[PDB]
Every structure is written in C-alpha cells, then in structure tokens.
Amino acid sequence: PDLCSRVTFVNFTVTRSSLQSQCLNEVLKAERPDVDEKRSDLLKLQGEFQLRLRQLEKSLLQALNEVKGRILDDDTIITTLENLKREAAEVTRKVEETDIVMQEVETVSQQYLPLSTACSSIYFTMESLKQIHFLYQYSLQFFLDIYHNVLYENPNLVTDHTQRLSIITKDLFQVAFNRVARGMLHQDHITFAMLLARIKLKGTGEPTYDAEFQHFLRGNEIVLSAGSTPRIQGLTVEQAEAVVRLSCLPAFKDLIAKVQADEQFGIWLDSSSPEQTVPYLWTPATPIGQAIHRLLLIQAFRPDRLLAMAHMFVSTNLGESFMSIMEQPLDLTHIVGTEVKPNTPVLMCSVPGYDASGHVEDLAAEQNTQITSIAIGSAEGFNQADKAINTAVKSGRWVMLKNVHLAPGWLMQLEKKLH
Amino acid sequence: ICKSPNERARLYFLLAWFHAIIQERLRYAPLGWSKKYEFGESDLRSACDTVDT
C-alpha cells in the first residue's frame, strides 16, 4: 500500500472491441491486401480532411474576430471568403469517399464479422481458462502466433474467399484446441473441447440452446422439489431426483409418464453402454439439438457415461476427428522446429514420476544438435546456466535446464533476461 | 526391434502390452494396485535391455 498510494495505476488490458478490431484488420491484411490498404488510405484521408476542416473553423473564427473595421471596406474579407469557398468545396467532395468508406465497412462487416466474434470468444475463453489448474496462462502473443499459423499457413492453399473463410474458421478451431491441449492435463481436454463446441454453436443458422445449457451447467445446484418421490419401478432415488430436476424443462415435460410408458426401455437407458443408443425423444430436430437432448438425458440417467456423451457431442459439433490427435504421441520435433520462437523457452511441466529429459535428449540425438543439460540447484549451476545461455545465444546451440522449479527467485530474472 | 531373431518383435510386443496393462491398472487404485507405484519409462528400458541381452 505504501507504493500503491504514491502512484496512479494504469492498465493497458485487452477488451472485446479492441480484440475484434485487431483480428478483423489482420484478417483483411491476410485475405484482401489491396482492399485493406485502400481502407487504411481512406481513414488517413478522412482524418486529414477533418483536420483541414478544424483548421478552417479556427482560421475563420480568428479572422472574423480581429477584423478591426468594417467587413465591406477590406479585401482580407474577400480572401477569407475565397478560402472558405474552397474549403466548402472540399467538404462537399468529402461525401464521395464517405460513401466509399461506407461500402468498405459494410462489405468487411458482412464478410468477416462472425470470424472476429469467434476470435474474441476463443481468446477470452483462453484467458478465463487459467482458473482451473494455475499452470497455463496464455498471453496475447500466443493467440497472435496461432493466427500467424492459421492465416499464413493454409493447408490445401483455393482462391475463393467464401469457402476460404470457412476453412480458416475450422482450421482456427482445430489448431487452437491442438495448441492449448498440448499443454494441459487429460482431464481438462474435454472441458476445453466442449467450450470450443459452445463457441462454434454460438457462432452459427442454428437456434441457441441457452436454457438447455444453463440447466446442464446448473441442474444439480438448482433447488428441486422436496419430498416428491416418484416411482422406484426402475430408477433409484438419485435418478428419480435427477428426473424431477429435469422435469421443469419445457422440452422434457412428461418424463415421469414417458419412463413408465416405455417399460421395455430398461436396457437402452440403464446398464449396457447408453452413450450409443439413447431412448425417448426431446418438429424436425437438428442433429446438434438431438445431441444436446441426449446429453441432458445421459446426465440425468447415467452420470458415469457423461464423459462419453460429451465426447460424442464434441464429435457431432466440431467433427469426429477433432480431438483424435491428443491420443497420438507428441511429435515434439515439428512443434519445436516450426511453431516456437527462439526467444520463447520451451516449458515441459511434468507430473511426478514421468520426466521429459529423455525426450529432449532424444530430440538432440535425432537433430544432431548439441545441448548443455545443467541441473538447477547450486550457485555453480546458476553460473554455468548463465554462461551456457549467453554462449547459446551467441552461437546457436540449445541449452537445457533440469529441475527448474527449485529456484523461482532466480526464475524471475531468468524470464526478465530472456525478454 | 528389427534385429534378428524374428521372435524379438513378438517379444517386444508382449513386453509393450504388459507394460501398458500394468501402467493402466494404476489409475484404478487401490483396486488395480494396492499402492501407487511408479512403473515409469526406466522400468520399460530395463526390461527391453534384459530381453535383448
């Protein structure tokens, strides 16, 4: 607080509108270069013309302020009249580039507004993701690196902007999930994937399931009927309470009637593997809506298969092979050699009992690149680490530090020196 | 793996399957294994080395 009292705090944080504008400008530069450059030229022109109008107003007010005599008896009045006529002509001509700017902004809006909304949603889910496991904290430069991978490395690179936008969106979702979940635990992969599924659903001619998702997230925490015990014909007390809590949904109204009407449906909803075949029903329903209804039914009936049902929902929403690369082994060579800046250290956070030093040394043997592996924990080790870092920056070799988590008080200036 | 004799491939397959089973059994503790052992990469390397020897 002694330092807090003496200074005026100013935060340059990132907002939704600023992120949307930056991502829209980047998309314009990547896709429509001449259109983006003429747009920028027109904004610069509009700013210059507005400055000229302000100069006109100030000059006219100053000239009429200090005439020091009759207006009709001076020629300076005539000169100011001529200048005002010229500036009236240019403010009249301003309407043409105003209309051209209007055409430009409507075109870019109708072409790339949902993409920028997806940009904002994905990056702010990315920032809010840090509330789980304290370990991942993704910065804005990480998202910008994702965009430099998406827009500038287009697989199967087309020459059609309408389908190129959809290709960019799908590739963005896929590589965002790949790059984030490459550095998370396996328990949070499904959470991140279904958050991205929610973003994709929000970004699309599909009705929003706001009440459905609100009840899915806050169905157990909501208050249910007290003392109302349904039939225990084929459902336990917990399943009956879940059915009671679900029954307030308008789509699932006569669930109590339906479960006993489908008396033969004791296998499609109980035992076996219910994630594949789901009984009952939620008008032609969309496949995503059917997946949502099946997910709610699974959460009400068999909470064990909730992970499988969420995986199937993610598969139906973003593609069957959306998260089929996580179970593949980690191809670290291409990731290091292609998508890692030399100024960014490669963090390898490992659970106890499973190290990565063998992986790094195998990489060194494969690429035939020399490494000084230095074990952190002594003053001599710190000096050797600084010397090796300086030599590696000068020459171009790789430097490796092991058991890095034993000196945060040194990691602070290590990060500062790296920056 | 491809080094002679040809049965070394099947032996390594059996060893990999055994390692995978006894490593996946650690998730369902204490029903799989009574204690949370660490059947890491080092045990796999030692088993491969002794099979080769």
Binding site: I132, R218, E221, L306 | -
Partner: peptide
Amino acid sequence: ERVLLTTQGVDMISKMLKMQMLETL
C-alpha cells in the same frame, strides 16, 4: 470405472461453471 467417471463428470461440470462465472458462527 463408474465412480471415477462420475466424479470426473462432476469435476468437469464444476470447472465449466467456474469458467462461466466471468461471463454469529
């Protein structure tokens, strides 16, 4: 795997609920 899968689903729901939060004794 039933209890483990159930508690994993509960933890997933709690994690996304924490995500949606930003958006005398």
